From a paper:
Nucleosomes are connected by a segment of linker DNA to form 10-nm “beads-on-a-string” nucleosomal arrays, which are further organized into a more condensed 30-nm chromatin fiber by the linker histones H1/H5.7,8 Using the newly developed 3C (chromosome conformation capture)-based technique and high-resolution microscopic methods, the higher-order spatial organization of chromatin in the nucleus has been explored at unprecedented resolution, revealing that chromatin fibers are further configured into chromatin loops, topologically associating domains (TADs), and chromatin compartments in the nucleus. Linker histones H1/H5 have been shown to play a fundamental role in chromatin compaction through different mechanisms. Abundant in higher eukaryotic cells, variant linker histone isoforms were found to adopt a tripartite structure, composed of a structured central globular domain (GD) (~80 residues) flanked by a short N-terminal domain (NTD) (20–35 residues) and a long C-terminal domain (CTD) (~100 residues). The GD plays an important role in the binding and locating of linker histones in the nucleosome, and the CTD is believed to be a major determinant of chromatin folding.
In this study, we determined the 3D cryo-EM structure of the H5-bound dodecanucleosome reconstituted with 12× 177 bp_601 DNA, core histones (H2A, H2B, H3, and H4), and linker histone H5 (termed as the H5-chromatin fiber thereafter) at 3.6 Å resolution. Similar to our previous structures of the H1.4-chromatin fiber, the overall 3D architecture of the H5-chromatin fiber comprises 3 tetranucleosomal structural units twisted against each other, forming a two-start left-handed double-helical structure with a zig-zag configuration. Indeed, our cryo-EM structure reveals that upon binding to the entry/exit linker DNA, the linker histone H5 in each nucleosome of the H5-chromatin fiber adopts almost the same configuration with an obvious α-helix structure in its NTD which we term as αN, and three α-helices in its CTD which we term as αC1, αC2 and αC3, respectively. The three α-helices in H5-CTD are organized into an HMG box-like motif and tightly interact with one of the entry/exit linker DNA. In each chromatosome, the histone H5 directly interacts with both the dyad and the entry/exit linker DNA through a three-contact mode with its NTD, GD, and CTD, respectively. Specifically, the H5-GD contacts the nucleosomal DNA in an asymmetrical off-dyad manner, while the H5-NTD binds to one of the entry/exit linker DNA and the H5-CTD binds to the other linker DNA. The L3 loop in the β-hairpin of the on-dyad binding GH5NCP is bent and folded back toward itself, whereas this loop is extended and binds the dyad-DNA in the off-dyad binding H5-GDchromatin.
Residue numbers in the entry:
A (entry chain Ae): 2966 to 3087
B (entry chain a7): 2282 to 2383
C (entry chain s): 2072 to 2166
D (entry chain U): 1838 to 1960
E (entry chain g): 2205 to 2272
F (entry chain 4): 2310 to 2396
DNA sequence: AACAGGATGTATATATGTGACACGTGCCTGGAGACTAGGGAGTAATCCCCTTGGCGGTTAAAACGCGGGGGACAGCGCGTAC
DNA sequence: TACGCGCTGTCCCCCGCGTTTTAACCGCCAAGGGGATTACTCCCTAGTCTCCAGGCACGTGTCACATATATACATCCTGTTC
């Protein structure tokens, strides 16, 4: 292809870096529909591309706050939990080694003096 | 390097293999194991009856998950669950797992 | 070190730290015990046991989180057997 | 190198270990399609000096696979609500709203609509 | 009928409606609240009371979900 | 002519006896006065999630009449699947 | 009115391995090319049914303030339970 | 072994519920229309068998590294008592 898509792949044509073509095979593999157009696989990658970048971007900020360079499963949970919109998308799931965000309740921490309210004697 | 027949299981048993009845093992989840889980939630104190109930809750949860994974296991005819039957069992029960598989 | 307030220190550490709280092999022999009744000589891989343990740990942590809010609802702090009954049924699990 | 298209060897790989110099062969391993290369690519874009851990990729590889399954699965269900036999970008444009709420739908649709728009009007 | 029409109109205008669809919207919402009241009652007895309060309502939802 | 009736809502159509009657369907003997205000918020939150999906189904079908099938499709995703009004 | 005590959390330089990448070869499979070919969709007329309101005629569900019973909130307290 | 904290006992005090007004609001009866959702007919541009070709990208050897994970020095903040 002198002017056709030999040089430019399907993913690069739409500006994406995700496989796109592998997704197109997945629709046929999963038998989601009898016929699949060209718009479907590229669109699915586009949702993944922004979701892939945004979650890593939010997690990447946690690594700097955590005094670490490489992203660990702890930061993946932190990025998801911090964003309330991400909670609706996912959060009824289990993340391997994700950890739990601090959720201390106000019923604990007896800020008032541990001595009795009436007098010093317990 | 095949050196015998296993069939149902316990290949080349004789007197070289070892096995135990394993009557009760839910007691392995003791006070420190339950307390650590409670600390993640934010619990201050835990009652005595909760420790046995926590074991009971774990027993029911494991029983529900395994029966789903066992069904997929016989379909593939494998004698062991590797990574996916647990994931598929967790997916169907609303406990979908990310990582360790898929 | 007051026992009530020291538990608060554990909460900060355990929530910050990421690790497997329950023992591995005692859980590994536990899941094997259940499998024998369902299917005798049913083998497990290393990955399968850890996946079951992590899912079980997260499930128990979520129950502890819910039962903790049941205690403050009753103007209490500690978890009683009544707390685990309300949390489980309201989720559609017990009944 | 001439042509090896006529294939009496499809499984191929190593069967008897009849080798000349380097040995170097095993049984044909099943292709484990993973998004590891592509997840790391966008990670460099948002934050170049971060890196990644192996356990993080395992979680994220499952996340990408499951998210696609949910989007494609919901689109398939929507493809049965109406009698349309073909799924295009519109079928998923509506599918994003049901699962991705709030600003996630806006980001997904805007990126998705731009991607399909720039997918065409080229070449 | 007026309530459901405005809720749809708040996000997308020019929407039509059917009586059967309105009944479906009513039945699902009523049963969702009806099941909540019984679920909320189990929180009241745990607090040694029979009243229903937002403290009971917020707790009843949270354990079951619908708030995250 | 943008100016139209926008003040409070039709959620007040959920009357005080109706809220009590809904509680009477469950096991109650006393409900606080803030429940009536709470039911308005809870009903709107549940309705918005369900109706938004139903609107998407109507838009996808290129229709404008909300049918019973569009309603049940919205419900079955998040539970409370309404048996009936389908097929 | 405020100091002591022992361990946990800090900096700062200090060791290691496993996790990671880079070569160098090797070989299908996944994309790409380029027409012939039959079937789901764009696009025109047809046709009845669906929703919007006239348009009155009783009737069962709201709307609201007063009354007297009682149940949730809250105070302390001695002994049980973690 | 010890005190933090269930549980009992008790009525502030603030309402959920019962009993009456109160007639306006929900509601169904006998018919039309304008707009919109399926049958019926025509023609059209992607993917889809032909029927071949070459490049990416996945393993198997071969070398050779970089940050995570905890250690030696050195030194402060927090929590819980007297």
């Amino acid at each position: 292809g002198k002017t056709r898509a030999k040089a430019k792949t399907r993913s690069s044509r739409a500006g994406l870096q995700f496989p796109v073509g592998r997704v197109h095979r997945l629709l046929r593999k999963g038998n989601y529909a009898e016929r699949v157009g060209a718009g479907a696989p590229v669109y699915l990658a586009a949702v993944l591309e922004y979701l892939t970048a945004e979650i890593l971007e939010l997690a990447g900020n946690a690594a700097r706050d955590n005094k670490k360079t490489r992203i660990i499963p702890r930061h993946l949970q932190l990025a998801v939990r911090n964003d309330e919109e991400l909670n609706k998308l996912l959060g009824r799931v289990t993340i391997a080694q994700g950890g739990v965000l601090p959720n201390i309740q106000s019923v604990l921490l007896p800020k008032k003096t541990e001595s009795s309210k009436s007098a010093k004697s317990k | 390097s095949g050196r015998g027949k296993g069939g149902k299981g316990l290949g080349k048993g004789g007197a070289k293999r070892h096995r135990k009845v394993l009557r009760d093992n839910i007691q392995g989840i003791t006070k420190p194991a339950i307390r650590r889980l409670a600390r993640r939630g934010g619990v201050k104190r835990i009652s005595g009856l909760i420790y046995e109930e926590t074991r009971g809750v774990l027993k029911v949860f494991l029983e529900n998950v395994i029966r789903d994974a066992v069904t997929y296991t016989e379909h593939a005819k494998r004698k062991t669950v590797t990574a996916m039957d647990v994931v598929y069992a967790l997916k169907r029960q609303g406990r979908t797992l990310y990582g360790f598989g898929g | 070190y007051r026992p009530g307030t020291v538990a608060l220190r554990e909460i900060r550490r355990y929530q910050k730290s990421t690790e497997l709280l329950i023992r591995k092999l005692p859980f590994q022999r536990l899941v094997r015990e259940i499998a024998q009744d369902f299917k005798t000589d049913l083998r497990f891989q290393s990955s399968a046991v850890m996946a079951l343990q992590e899912a079980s740990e997260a499930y128990l942590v979520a129950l502890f989180e819910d039962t903790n809010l049941c205690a403050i609802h009753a103007k209490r702090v500690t978890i009683m057997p009544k707390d685990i009954q309300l949390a489980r049924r309201i989720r559609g699990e017990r009944a | 190198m001439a042509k090896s298209a006529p294939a009496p060897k499809k499984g191929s790989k190593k069967a008897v270990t009849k080798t000349q110099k380097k040995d170097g062969k095993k049984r044909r391993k099943s292709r484990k399609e993973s998004y590891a290369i592509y997840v790391y690519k966008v990670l460099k874009q948002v934050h170049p000096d971060t890196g990644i851990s192996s356990k993080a990729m395992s979680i994220m590889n499952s996340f990408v696979n499951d998210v696609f399954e949910r989007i494609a699965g919901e689109a398939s269900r929507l493809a049965h609500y109406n009698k349309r036999s073909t799924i295009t970008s519109r079928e998923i444009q509506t599918a994003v709203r049901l699962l991705l709420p709030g600003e996630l739908a806006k980001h997904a649709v805007s990126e998705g609509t731009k991607a399909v728009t720039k997918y065409t009007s080229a070449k």
